Amino acid sequence: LRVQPEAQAKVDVFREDLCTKTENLLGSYFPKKISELDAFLKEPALNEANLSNLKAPLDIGPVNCNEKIVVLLQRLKPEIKDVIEQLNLVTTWLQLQIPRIEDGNNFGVAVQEKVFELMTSLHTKLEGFHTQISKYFSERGDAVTKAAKQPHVGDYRQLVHELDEAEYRDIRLMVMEIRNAYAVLYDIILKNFEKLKKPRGETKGMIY
Template sequence: MEKKLNGIPVDKIDPLDPQVKDKYQIFKEEITKSALLSLRERIPQKILYFNNILTEYSKSGLLFNSDDLDKESYQSINNHSPESKRTKRAHEEANQVLPSHKQIFLELEQIKLEASELIEIITNIKLWIQLNIPRIEDGNNFGVGIQEEVIQELTRVEDTAFNLYDSIVKYYMAR
């Protein structure tokens, strides 16, 4: 028996307008394609990519190439000068911009790129799972708990990716 409120079926959440319903179906199909592409291709490629990076770094024993390090050293502030000169020098040095270490800058940019891709992948997969959770009224609730746990784990991964972004911003602010 179908429940109705003012002549509108309550147990179905599908759009009533046929055009909106068609667009919604197309949207669901696009999300499904994107999620399946991520699960079948993008995630395995990322696993191989990061495994290769770890293998390279573990062989060399170095995270950074010492040949790429800046050869220029920056002098520290000399605190033995009189107060007026120290204040003047502090203001002059506060306005100087020290160049970023090129390799650290490139690594941080790569991390930002990887984090944004991870966020995109996780968001698509979460949305796909949420769109495929069956209605409990159908009696087909097998696996709903598992789907909800997977969504929670994906949310933790997404939070980690956002924290990567946040830590990069904090690093630049601290500089």
């Protein structure tokens, strides 16, 4: 193909924009964003020891759930969406740094692929975290409906109380998963960055 100094350079600018962001994220956004989740987990609302008080009593219309737990779900949900955005920006940046395909000097390419495969674990888990939260709504909504359908069984009220604790338990887990999603990822990038951003090339043999 030919050369287009304008339209083709707009692609290089898109890469230089992600390269400018990547250095700005590592030096500024990531160290602050990782620390914000630390104080987020230290919040006394997530440190609650006794979950017997957060059990939502059902009146068996006068039907409602625990609002404090829902607010805890409303606080964690943006943090789950924030890491998914940062996960896609790094995944795109790692793909644009892949050099040409050659048999020799391909060890550094496999290093970039090894770090790239570490992201796949985060792509699946982060989507499973939000899907599991939305699944709790249907589980707790049907448990009350089944109790409202047949006004006999009292285990559905205990099932809601269990799912009240089941959400809070998985919240503290996900908060640690979100914090580890930034922290471990930020360490992996620093562990493979400096001289291994361009592992080989720009060296050659003095002759041919």
